[PDB]
Structures are given as structure tokens and as C-alpha cells.
Symmetry: C3
Subunit: 268 residues, 3 copies
């Protein structure tokens, strides 16, 4: 109760004494943003293992300038499939709030479950379906937000419009769709992929949804994109999903996805 509040304050205080303190946007460097940390100038690098109460995982907080703009980046992320509690997965988001972060940008890798979404496509996330445990289960922390937060437009529409404009300017094709969050860590069966596609999902991944719920609970505006890293449909007789193939697609998308996120930061 009071201990929980204290833990948030301790992490925030530790980071606040170290970071530039001018960032208003935080970015989770998920799949597809693998080139972005290198682009941050005048880096202050703070290992996760040094920050009070951050889950034991590299993992670094990186402060600096990206796209001409102050940023805080989360290099490394905590996934529910790794055994972290939802409190651990989402702890850094509430720390960002205490630092004065107003906006959260996030990327991830996802399997396409709508046939218009192909390997290598970059999908702006317009909505999600949560099939992981809700991270807000437990006593409400009033310091962060209300008991029953609204999720009608969890993915900020103005950020979406700006990102579409940026993609057009940069001549980068983008798709837009619904992200379905599952725990994993096994990839889905064809029956599962089909089910989620049938009920309106466009891509499926194992992250992001918990952070988005927690961000929205505390009023942070969210922009998210998925790299479509694999196609969960039209399976060849010998098709196998493979982490190295997912990473191949994530790596291949990083330049262009990174260009969008880097241009978006100054626009928000």
C-alpha cells in the first residue's frame, strides 16, 4: 500500500537524479526498433539492474536526444511469459509517469492473422484485445489513476494520424489494425490463429497490452506499432515458426519502423 508507493518513488528518484529530465516521451524498444538506441545522441545509460525495484532481467534506461527531441528509452522489456508478475512487467510505466512522461511509444513483433497482413508489413496498432491477465487486478493505486479506467481509444487517434502522415512523407507503406495479446511463449496453433482472426484480430503478439493498460490508467498517451514477422495463415505443409525468423523480420523492419518513431517524437 504505502510500501508500493514508496517503491515507485524510489525508482523514480534514482532515475531523476541521473536523467536529463526534459523527456516527455518514453519509447519501449521492442522488435522493429533494434536500430533506434544507436540513433539516440548524448546518451545517459542506466542499467535496469541498478534501478530500485526494476525486475531482475541488456536492460537499460537510455536518456538522450532522438529526432531532435528529448527521449527516455527502455532497452529491454519484461514479458509475462518469462515468469514476471504483471506488477513487474508494468512497473517501469508507472515510473515513467512519475518522471513526467506524457507519451509512450511502443513496438512489438506480431504474427499476421488477417490475410492482408504479410511478413515485413508495419502495422499501426489501432486497438487491442487483451488475453493476458489484466495488470490492474488488485487494490487500485489512486496515485496513478481511477478504479475503472476507460479504454475506448487506448491508441491515441492524433498520434495515429500523425504517424500516417509521417509514413506518407517518408514513402513507407503502413497498415493499421487490431493487436491481440496472448501470454505465449509457444507460438499459436492454426486453430488459435484462425479463432483470433475470426473475432477481429489482425496480428497476435506476447507483449504490449499490459503496458498499454497501465499507461492509459495513468493518462499517458500511447502509440504502438507491430512488425508483422510471420503469417499465421495459409500454412505450407512443412512450415514452422522460428524465433530466428521472427528476429530476421524484426531486424529487416528496424530501419523503416525506426524512421517513423524517430520523426513522430518531435511531432507529439
Amino acid at each position: 500500500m504505502k510500501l508500493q508507493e514508496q517503491h515507485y518513488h524510489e525508482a523514480a528518484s534514482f532515475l531523476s537524479s541521473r536523467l536529463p529530465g526534459d523527456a516527455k516521451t518514453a519509447i519501449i524498444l521492442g522488435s522493429g526498433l533494434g536500430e533506434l538506441a544507436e540513433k539516440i545522441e548524448n546518451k545517459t545509460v542506466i542499467p535496469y539492474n541498478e534501478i530500485p525495484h526494476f525486475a531482475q532481467a541488456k536492460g537499460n534506461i537510455i536518456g538522450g536526444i532522438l529526432g531532435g527531441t528529448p527521449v527516455v528509452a527502455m532497452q529491454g522489456r519484461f514479458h509475462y511469459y518469462e515468469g514476471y508478475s504483471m506488477d513487474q512487467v508494468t512497473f517501469p510505466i508507472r515510473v515513467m509517469k512519475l518522471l513526467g512522461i506524457e507519451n509512450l511509444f511502443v513496438s512489438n513483433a506480431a504474427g499476421g492473422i488477417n490475410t492482408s497482413f504479410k511478413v515485413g508489413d508495419l502495422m499501426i496498432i489501432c486497438d487491442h484485445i487483451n488475453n493476458l491477465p489484466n495488470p490492474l487486478i488488485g487494490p487500485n493505486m489512486d496515485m496513478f489513476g481511477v478504479r475503472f479506467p476507460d479504454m475506448t481509444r487506448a491508441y491515441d487517434r492524433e498520434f495515429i494520424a500523425k504517424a500516417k502522415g509521417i509514413a506518407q512523407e517518408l514513402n513507407i507503406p503502413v497498415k493499421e489494425g487490431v493487436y491481440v495479446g496472448l501470454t505465449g511463449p509457444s507460438y499459436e496453433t492454426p486453430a488459435e490463429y484462425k479463432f483470433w482472426g475470426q473475432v477481429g484480430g489482425d496480428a497476435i503478439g506476447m507483449s504490449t497490452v499490459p503496458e498499454v493498460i497501465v499507461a492509459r490508467h495513468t493518462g499517458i498517451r500511447v502509440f504502438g506499432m507491430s512488425v508483422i514477422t510471420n503469417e499465421g495463415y495459409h500454412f505450407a505443409d512443412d512450415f514452422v515458426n522460428d524465433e530466428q525468423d521472427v528476429i530476421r523480420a524484426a531486424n529487416a523492419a528496424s530501419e523503416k519502423m525506426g524512421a517513423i518513431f524517430a520523426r513522430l517524437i518531435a511531432a507529439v
Copy 2:
């Protein structure tokens, strides 16, 4: 196992010596029943915090239109951090008191376009998307390992309720309640999904109690106040707890009238 049994008995004993003892119907005073407790006569009020093993709210014993009732004022939700054992503990205590019928109301978001704000929905079935409350060693004293859920919502109660509503000139809807944990409200994609697969309203309660009631052979009647519409979202629409409560409060007179008459009819 034997300690669990003790705990149920300890809570039941505590209430047993403090309540009249003839009540056959229990009521969870959820959203839409906010005026009913006032109408209970010859009240015995027992705070939850005094009842052995109740999660850390009142039990109200009394007479509602000539009929002895036990009412639960305040309820435990999974989104609060309670275990399912804690959420549903009072239902098993009710069974030990000789309760035969459970009446329950809740607030729910409409996910079928024929369910609108202010509508009173008789629950005819549910879809459970919370953890099943019976996971764990079966409590043989309460029921069997694999309880049937074919007609979890008693058909005779539904018929009676419909007759009562017609008589009182209160329109009612009937439909499927989908239970989710919350506590955040759903996204449009989630609302659309649950509507697509046959849900009519979505809420964050009730399902665990109904599973536990049916496990021990308690007959169930449930209604939802449709407190918000999870469809056709305006560009600036936001869900808001105070607006949900507004609809619950506005529904309380008429919903309470139905429940009060049903209590007398069973």
C-alpha cells in the same frame, strides 16, 4: 481441506445464532438493487468485518414483503485482488444457512445493439472469462467434482420474473452475460468480439457466484442493468464509473420492484 470446512462452518454458526433462520432466499444487492435494503423490515445488520473468515459490507437479515431474506450489501470482486475462494465464500455460507435461492443483480455494458442504457436484462445464460472458482480440491460437502451448467439461470424464476414485469408494466430484456475480470473497461475490439460470439452484456462480477451456487444446488436468478453501450462509439466517448452508477441508481426502483415481487413468488 478440513480447515476449509471448519471455516465455512464457523461463518455459518456466527450468522446462524444472529439471524431468524427461516430465510430461503439470499440476495446480492448489486448495481440496480441500491434501494432494496431500505425496504427490508425487522433488519438484523451484521458487518462483514465481524463475520469469521469473510474477506476484509453487511449481511442484512429481515423480511421483504412478508418473505424472510438474507441480503449481501457489498460484494467482493476478483478485480479487487480477492481470490476466487474469497469472492465466493459467502455463497457457500448461504448454503449452510439453508438458503435455496440466490438472486443477484449487476451492472453490465451492452454489446448487442438491442441492449441500451437503462435496459433491465434478465440473465438467461453466461460466458465465463474469469478464472473458474472451483479450481482446486473439490469440496464434497458442497457438491460434485464436475457440476452441470446447462440451465444455470433457473427457467421457472425467469418465467415468474417476466410475468411480474409484465404485471408491473416494466419492460425487460433477456440475454447472455459475459463475465470478464476487469477492472479496466473493454476496448471496442473486445466488446465487438464478445458480442460476435453471442454475449449481450459484459460485467465484472456474478459469474463466480453463480458457478459456486450451482455447484451446491442453489437456484439462481440474475439481472443486469445495462449501464453503458459498448458499441457505436462517438469520437469522444469515454466509459466512466460515475455514469455507470448513474444508470444503476436510475434502474434501482424498477429493478428492486421486480426482485421484491419475485422473492414473494418463489
Copy 3:
């Protein structure tokens, strides 16, 4: 650290079993519903009670080694269900022990409620795919000794085994169905709305087991064959219909001869 201790537990269970079993089995069978006559068909049995095997979940249950359908086998008589309160680690622990024994193939049966109107009480369904609605058993740090962090599940139910089983069923004149198994936790049976939902999104039968073991088997490269006995129909409910564990058991028992005949012929073919 914690990995060390977990690896040690699997090794302890496997060492205990390997000092006692014949050691020639490549196929293990979970004796679920529909296989209630199969243990008696195993010849030259070595019976090892679960309560003697290091780290097997507490309760009867036995590992049985011997010969079935002319072929070495290890059978799991008794299984652990998530609805009983076991962790997924406990539910699936025996599967990883099988891997350490050199088991390459896992055959599994279960009971399930039909949710496609083509699937009727007493039908024998070859499982061609599943939908998992129980907690994923691999959540937690990955055990590299068993498999990779993100295992593929594209053909969790081996297509070659399915083809062999269909051929066997034809030869033996036993009709079979084929379809998608939906795994739910239970332990309460589903509501009609739930049965309808799962049917709508492509499930053919619903049960409370099997999926966790299949995920863990595939994580460690074990080839899987599964069948469900359709023990009840989760559709077209009569006004007075009730699901009943006793009716499920009767149907499972009634299917056991023909289901067992398929599994016994399949073991030599794989």
C-alpha cells in the same frame, strides 16, 4: 540456481524410473478416458506407483512399462488435471521425465463434449489441432535442456500419426471423426453459451486436459497423437438435460474397446 534445482528434479524422477523400467520404450501413452481397458492389455508389466517416483505430484496413479501391440511402451495410468489445483509444472512434469527416458512419441486420450453437431456421443475423434484456454505451461524461465524459448505449434498433432491412425481405423472397421479440441480449465461443465462460442470459433470438442501435456511434449520435440471420446453433446439441449460425470464415464468406458484397439495397433506403426 533455481534452474539447477529444477533440472535435478527431472533427473531424479528419470533415474528412479530408468533403474526400474525395461528401457526399450519409445512411445508413452497417457491412459485417459477411452483407454480404460488398455493397461490390462499390456504384457509383462512393470508397475511403478506415482507416489514412489521422486517429484511426481501427490494424489491411484502408476507408471506401467511392458509390451503393447507387440511393442515396448510406457503408460501413465492416472493423470493430473489443472482443475484439481496442480500447477502446470506439476501437470506436465511426467512428460519431461518421459523425454529423459528416451520417449519419442506421446499418445494421449481424453473425454470431451461435442460442440460440432457432426460429433455425437460415442464418436471417436482424432485430434488434429487444439485451442488452448488453460494457462500456458511454459510460462516461466525456459528450460534449455528441454527446448527453445518459443516453440512452434503449427502441426502439434503429428500428421503422419493421424494418417496411420485413419488407415488403422479403416482396416479395423472402426469409424472415426477428426477435429479441433478446445482445452478449458473446468471443472464445471460449460454453459450452452460457452459451448456455442467455442463451436462458432472452430472447436469441435471441449475438454479439461491434454493441451498442457501437448505443449510441453512439442517444446521438447516429442511427436503427439491424441483422440477424444465424445462423451456428451454440448448442443441441442433437451429441456431437462443435465451433464453428469456418470454419463461421461459410461460413454468413455463404452468407447474403450475400440479406442484401445486403435492405440494398440498404432504403437507398432510409429
